[PDB]
């Protein structure tokens, strides 16, 4: 085939995951040695083909994650997908620069913390006593515009 055979090489070349010899990739897979294979990789970013020797790359640090958190501004909640392949062990670096330095949404501590676009200043600040936060929760809201009085009643 033409598109199928070329896709096959990028599949097993990405198993190597690095720029290897095209002829090797044309012979290690033993299938995609045709003219359509290498050109397709030259036209496909799945095997990022440089003008230099045989290149096969498929386009790293929490700094990129750090800006991506700020680069997801006014955008939708992103998962952990870009890390696990781009940067291994997302869930470590999710809470490594914790306290909103690297914020992410732990969907559960059994589901790889499926996240959204999260970045903040303090973010969690769990050091605040939970009981105090519970006591903070324990503050019941009174009623309507009498509460504008009630805050002035309470000395606010």
């Amino acid at each position: 085939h033409d598109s199928s055979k070329l896709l096959w090489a990028t599949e097993y070349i990405q198993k190597k995951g690095k720029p290897v010899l095209v002829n090797e990739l044309l012979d290690y897979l033993s299938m995609k040695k045709d003219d359509k294979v290498i050109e397709l990789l030259k036209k496909l970013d799945r095997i990022e083909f440089d003008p230099k020797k045989g290149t096969f790359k498929y386009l790293h640090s929490p700094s990129e994650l750090l800006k991506l958190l700020r680069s997801q501004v006014t955008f939708k909640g992103i998962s952990c997908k870009d890390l696990k392949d781009g940067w291994p062990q997302c869930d470590e670096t999710i809470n490594q620069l914790e306290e909103d330095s690297k914020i992410l949404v732990l969907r559960t501590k059994k589901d790889k913390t499926p996240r959204y676009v999260w970045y903040n200043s303090g973010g969690n600040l769990k050091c605040i006593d939970e009981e105090f936060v519970k006591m903070w929760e324990n503050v019941q809201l009174p009623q309507f515009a009498e509460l504008p009085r009630k805050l002035q009643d309470l000395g606010l």
Binding site: T74, K76, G77, D100, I103, L104, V105, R107, P114, Y116, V117, W118, N120, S121, G122, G123, N124, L125, I128, F132, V133, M135, W136, N138, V139, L141, P142, F144, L147, P148, K150, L151, L154, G155, L156
Partner: protein, 118 residues
């Protein structure tokens, strides 16, 4: 304006003495005042128990007064969305009182103090 500070201040508390995910529902519906409820659910693409208890705080603090953004459905039937028409004044009003209350849990506590009498 200060309106941004109002939203800014909301982020701080909802991230100072609240968890990180608390501000996600902030920004999402802060993008547009009259927003369809699913849009936040869709972009977050998360469960209803990963959204329900978060919705609790938005109305438990009355910060997101989710206005029933009724639309004109094409089928001639019921149509509405939870568009969080933020009640900026009332939201903080309780908050200030809320803040005061914890201070009372310290202003009273000053008499619970250093030197033993009992």
């Amino acid at each position: 304006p200060i309106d941004d500070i109002v939203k800014n201040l909301l982020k701080f508390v909802v991230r100072g003495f609240y968890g990180g995910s608390f501000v996600l529902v902030l920004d999402a519906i802060l993008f547009h005042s009259v927003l369809a409820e699913d849009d936040l659910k869709q972009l977050l693409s998360i469960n209803k128990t990963e959204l329900g208890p978060l919705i609790a705080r938005l109305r438990s603090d009355r910060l997101i007064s989710i206005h029933k953004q009724r639309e004109y459905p094409p089928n001639s039937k019921s149509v509405e969305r939870v568009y969080y028409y933020v009640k900026y004044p009332h939201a903080i009003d309780a908050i200030k009182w809320k803040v005061h209350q914890v201070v009372q849990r310290l202003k009273d506590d000053l008499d619970k103090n250093s030197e033993p009498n009992g």
